[PDB]
Symmetry: C3
Subunit: 332 residues, 3 copies
């Protein structure tokens, strides 16, 4: 390389490369710290109550143990928003649902079980389901669940006021640091009366379900009418070089949905088996509820000698490479 008093033409390039190395690779990219993931655990608590007046059954009270189907508290929990109830289900021959099939004569139906959407073992006769249409007689739960009529006004429409408390405990084992979403800032008197907000209360662990649904980008009424999916993501990007107080979680609410023309909403059927008058019966509930999925992911970085030395060596190497490259480009 010719050095006939080139001047600052390459001396400035050297300084620029050095500044870039010491700023972006070392400080910006946090190259002087080792990073590790966390082990996380989420507990959910839904405080609320819903009094639903249902024709033929009277008032029904839904408490924390009622709308919460897991009833133990985990990441993927579902809060009841609407339900279709078919009680007093006993095992006996009965007329099947009109959606399964319509046979005016008993010769039309065949003894056996349907391959698609099996509702029961067909006896072989067609018993009129009502005065208009006739269905085939099958053995199974006698009161069939007719989901054709879905309640337009949400029965558990108060779910937008059911307070959701999320206790997220994370632990970095590489540095042996255990933290919880209940930061030192948050305390008892705060949790006595507080609601989470993006800017007002960014650390409140009490998330209003309505507020969460609104932040996810969905209307609470239309979603509760049929069902939906909301994902709460808890990030724990922190720097352990500072005090532990400066580490705070970040909550982000996403809405997982799709086209409302094909299978709109989230619905599932469950049963409550019991024994009444010496007979084994059950109450079938087809519930459309919102599925809240909690995903916690974070990373902690602490100062370490080996990564710092490795980054310094790589920076010196790339500085030399860039100097040689710029010299060759200037000299062509």
């Amino acid at each position: 390389v010719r050095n006939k008093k080139v001047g600052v033409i390459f001396r400035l390039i050297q300084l620029v490369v050095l500044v870039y190395v010491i700023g972006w690779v070392f400080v910006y990219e946090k190259g002087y710290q080792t990073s590790s993931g966390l082990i996380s655990s989420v507990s959910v608590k839904l405080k609320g109550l819903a009094v639903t007046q249902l024709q033929g059954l009277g008032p029904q009270v839904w408490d924390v143990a009622d709308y919460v189907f897991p009833a133990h508290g985990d990441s993927s929990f579902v809060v009841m928003t609407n339900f279709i109830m078919t009680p007093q289900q006993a095992q006996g021959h009965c007329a099947e649902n009109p959606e399964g099939g319509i046979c005016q004569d008993d010769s039309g139906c065949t003894p056996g079980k349907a391959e698609r959407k099996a509702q029961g073992i067909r006896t072989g006769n067609c018993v009129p389901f009502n005065g208009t249409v006739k269905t085939c007689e099958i053995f199974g739960w006698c009161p069939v669940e007719v989901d054709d009529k879905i309640p337009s006004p949400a029965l558990l429409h108060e779910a937008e006021n059911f307070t959701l408390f999320i206790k997220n405990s994370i632990s970095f084992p590489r540095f042996k640091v255990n933290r919880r979403n209940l930061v030192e800032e948050v305390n008892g008197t705060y949790m006595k009366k507080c609601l989470y907000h993006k800017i007002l209360h960014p650390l409140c662990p009490v998330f209003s379900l309505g507020y969460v649904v609104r932040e996810s980008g969905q209307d609470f009424r239309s979603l509760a009418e049929k069902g939906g999916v909301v994902g709460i993501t808890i990030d724990w990007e922190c720097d352990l070089d500072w005090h532990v107080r400066h580490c705070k979680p970040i909550y982000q609410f996403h809405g997982l949905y799709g086209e409302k023309n094909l299978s709109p909403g989230f619905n599932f059927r469950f049963a409550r088996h019991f024994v009444q008058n010496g007979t084994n019966r059950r109450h079938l509930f087809k519930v459309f509820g919102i599925r809240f999925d909690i995903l916690v992911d974070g990373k902690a970085g602490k100062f370490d000698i080996i990564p710092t030395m490795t980054t310094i060596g790589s920076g010196i190497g790339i500085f030399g490479v860039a100097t040689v490259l710029c010299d060759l480009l200037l000299l062509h």
Copy 2:
């Protein structure tokens, strides 16, 4: 200094090859001009089917969607009932324990307390004969102790290979703010009315046959349902957002998570349905051997961006210079 005296194309061809490699595998193949991110996915599983099991002494039992589905709400890890051992009318009262726990001919042999390993009840101290042949120790617990020695070889819920499964997978890339569902624009309502998933015939069908899934996982459905098994369905969403969003389609892959059948074969678990009958708190115990289906979704997106393109061009120029210098030094020794 590098000697340059009519070297020829010996190094020019090397430079051209390096430039092609930079503009190719580095840029086009590895998608160096696109930024990538993961998705937030949620799975909803719905089982459609019904099983009529004729049990001696209990009559016909109808297992519907709310019966074989134990979570009953829909989770990535869900178990479908395939066989069960039923013990009804369990009430709290002193009774003879299981012969597997312990055999004592005389009451002095048993000691009052609780067994340290595989505890079945608080030992009363007396040995009440479980039957005419063997004598077990009296313990205070559920009087009809469950005897799982005889597992039904013909699967009670053997019709599980025809039960349909609908999986609704909702993914969302927040970096690009794009939401997608496994129900692609191609899959329509009339299609979903009558459809079964297949590898080549129906690669986008969201309706899976449990028997077909078990066959694709690499296991026989009968032997699995007899004792239990684990099937993992992986949903991939590798897509490129540079094209139209319609071209983004999920990929379903089935795996069988099994082990040596000589030590603890299958998946079994005991659950109890409690109730009140005749003013007494009783329960029905079920030891169910079922298939555990674990739904795992993993995917990544890609969208054009300026900064990745610039840094890839920079790295390409940097390595093109280094490779040229290295080839020149190797040629000149």
Copy 3:
């Protein structure tokens, strides 16, 4: 650059760079092995029994299907350690909990529902909860749960003898290799009588809950009194270049806890609905239990030729770069 009897000054640097390439880059970092992840499935089985004598209810036997709420078997499961029981809950008008509010006269309470911690629809009257304090009349579960007195002696304190058998089946699909925690070493007679230990029995699949809690860094009594979270991480770092017998899992126990002054432990509520004497009743249970979450992650490495050639090429390149750099640094 200048090459005139430079000596071994740069030859030693070249040799060191070559050793670094053929060593840490190739041997240590497994540059000749491609890596693949696994699909995992955890199955838990609890064995044990604990009779909890409760005043007014008699002996209560708790079996595997009782304290294990995820009876279907799940990685994230809760084991009942203490419970507050309120039996025979029927829907009707009753006095609310004194924690909600105290109104001496009926005019003090207002008809409707509470916004925070709703216990029931207020009827507008104040019926005395007892002889001392007076609360507002609400419609709901008549036996309101009074969780003020938490039993200091843990009812299910025998949870430290509840043997936990974990079956973790993993599969690497890229290499199509299936593995299970029941390794070839662990035989039937071994599983007949063994307890897991860090050094003594590092392969026994029977984990004692008390031992796990002790290894997590928490006392079992104080934790079971109010609840806790213990996470079991099962790693499967293996090298498929050797025989599959050498691949053994690694179990680690972490304790995910926080400040005990604000929301201590893990607690939830559930109910058992039934029909007695023609009336729909339930038994409410507020359970303080330990939450066990099983997280499984691993990596399998198999010899491949493409990563080997890539690492060889990168090593030759960085060796040439380091040679040029050291020569330029020596010649200034």
